[PDB]
């Protein structure tokens, strides 16, 4: 319906390939979206750490408010979009979000101009688009 996977033999295997890449990519973007929803406290945490290694540790060792991404994060489809290698201790627990080391690493590598209105929105648009692609891919394979 959206033509997400190029025609040309082994469509099902190639569809599964796109699905698993999309989940990995959506996982990172989800971390960034969450960080961008909490940017003051995220930045305070980093300023308050002596090293990037200690900041990464701080980022993952406490829960984050869902903020402006709560509605997306709590959707049943968004849970279904999580990578299946992801342990149950990560994502949403008791109203708060728990980051992985990989998502914390990407947050630390954000550049300051990502905080501008248009760049923040492009991260959210890209995350939503990925969620939509994943839901579509999964549905194709649900038969």
């Amino acid at each position: 319906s959206s033509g997400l996977v190029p025609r040309g033999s082994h469509m099902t295997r190639r569809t599964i390939f796109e699905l698993r890449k999309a989940r990995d990519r959506a996982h990172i973007l989800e971390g960034l979206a969450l960080a961008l929803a909490n940017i003051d406290e995220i930045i305070e945490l980093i300023k308050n750490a002596p090293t990037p290694a200690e900041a990464k540790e701080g980022l993952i060792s406490r829960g984050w408010d869902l903020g402006n991404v709560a509605s997306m994060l709590e959707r049943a489809g968004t849970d279904a979009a999580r990578p299946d290698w992801l342990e149950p201790e990560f994502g949403i627990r008791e109203g708060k979000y728990f980051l992985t080391e990989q998502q914390a690493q990407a947050i630390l590598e954000l550049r300051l101009h990502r905080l501008t209105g248009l760049e923040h929105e492009k991260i959210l648009d890209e995350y939503k688009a990925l969620l939509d692609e994943i839901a579509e891919l999964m549905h194709i394979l649900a038969s």
């Binding site: 990172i28 960034l32 990407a106 590598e109 550049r111 101009h113």
Partner: protein, 102 residues
């Protein structure tokens, strides 16, 4: 010089890669190498979009093949023709996409 566009003087590679952009910091210009990115004409082709920025300039419509980024001898920069400084953000973001996945 950073963001300067150069004509590819190699007849062999000129057809698919007419131009290349220097992306190396000017602070490192005593190095005898340059990190550059090839441009390919859009006509000689969809591109990953966030990886391969589309360049609309006086020389025409190009795709910047970030994934083919490579260091070259500074001697091949003999023919500067234009500059891409207003694409600084798009170029740095594409490079980030290749390396951090951000």
């Amino acid at each position: 010089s950073q963001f300067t566009l150069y004509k590819n003087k190699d007849k062999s590679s000129a057809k698919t890669y007419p131009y290349f952009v220097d992306v190396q910091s000017d602070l490192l210009d005593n190095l005898n190498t340059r990190l550059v990115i090839p441009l390919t004409p859009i006509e000689l082709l969809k591109a990953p979009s966030h990886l391969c920025p589309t360049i609309h300039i006086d020389e025409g419509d190009f795709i910047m093949l970030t994934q083919q980024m490579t260091s070259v001898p500074v001697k091949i920069l003999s023919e500067p023709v234009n500059e891409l400084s207003t694409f600084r953000n798009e170029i740095i973001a594409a490079i980030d996409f290749l390396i951090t996945g951000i």
